[PDB]
């Protein structure tokens, strides 16, 4: 079981990485929308 516990380092360590990366890709989606939201708000101020 000590060896299981050593495996548990890496097993929970990677889940930490897993949940973190789930968020990291979800960022990528959200940030492309962040970009346009700001770009669009500017583009119209200029237009008016």
């Amino acid at each position: 079981e000590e060896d299981r516990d050593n495996a548990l380092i890496q097993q929970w360590r990677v889940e930490d990485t897993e949940m973190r990366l789930r968020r990291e890709t979800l960022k990528q989606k959200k940030l492309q929308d962040l970009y346009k939201y700001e770009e669009e708000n500017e583009k119209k101020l200029i237009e008016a």
Partner: protein, 49 residues
Amino acid sequence: QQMKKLEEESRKAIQIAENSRKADLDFIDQELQKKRANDNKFIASKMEE
């Protein structure tokens, strides 16, 4: 009568050695079963937050 004190010598050679050494083992079993509970709790207590 020596042979009688000798049958008694076994009792006086202390069958209680069972109980004495056993007591020392009753102690190791608490160290062991405490740990067994902790092996299941060491797994349960280290996760998820």
